[PDB]
Amino acid sequence: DNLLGEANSFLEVLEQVSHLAPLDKPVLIIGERGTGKELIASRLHYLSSRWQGPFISLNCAALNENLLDSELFGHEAGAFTGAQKRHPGRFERADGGTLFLDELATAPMMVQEKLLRVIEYGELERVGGSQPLQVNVRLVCATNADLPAMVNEGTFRADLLDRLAFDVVQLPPLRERESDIMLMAEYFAIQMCREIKLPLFPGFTERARETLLNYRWPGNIRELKNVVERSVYRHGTSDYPLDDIIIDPFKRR
DNA sequence: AGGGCTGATCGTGCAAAAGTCGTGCCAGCCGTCT
């Protein structure tokens, strides 16, 4: 329920991912719009020997301070003013374990070439402490597929990405998943009802279930969660079965 | 019974005002030649 039940093909892929988890090889990952490819990564990291090691996942390419790539390894403060440099860094935080990337999609072509070169050769040096790169323990990249690079060539510098052919993982649509979708929805509903402290599950008309099934699920299980939330809030009661399920909060009446 | 406040610990720069040096150069004088 709170874990990744996953479809049958998704189950086989999950087995493959849990296996590749011990493989600390650098990776680039792809999940759907609202599939949630992160939880499988956490399950793998637990399955990886890097489970004990730190697994700092990239913070969506956040742009705090001017260190930027030197945010990967920087200094804290001059001794005369403040505190010691104390060797704190971003590329260093994921120490002894996994290292996950996020919001890799948003980048332009220049930083794309930079990342490609870092893959080719990586060094970490900071005014404050730091430690040698070229380790990148259990490295894995994610969220790049949200914005494709060089799809028709051009865009970001993904020619090297074509050259850099470390293994990748696709993402089938939720509509194409054909898993226990109603079961996952029920699990989410029960979790919400507990969170909502609801009297009980009011129920759902199987006709309502089939009607809600008439949807592309563009946000995948995230779309499922949002639609369930809207449908339940519309129900707002535990009395009678939900003959209504939320198509879209954007509408009129 | 409730608040405050405390300080364990927090080091290799450089700038501020100020001077001092570079450099010349103007006033006087006496050796001189007038």
Ligand SMILES: Nc1ncnc2c1ncn2[C@@H]1O[C@H](COP(=O)(O)OP(=O)(O)O)[C@@H](O)[C@H]1O
């Ligand atoms: N098979 C699954 N097992 C557990 N949780 C899931 C599953 N599929 C989707 N989810 C949920 O969907 C949400 C998607 O969130 P997010 O990670 O932003 O999606 P994406 O990775 O597509 O951006 C996650 O919070 C996750 O809890």
Ligand SMILES: [Mg+2]
């Ligand atoms: Mg996401």
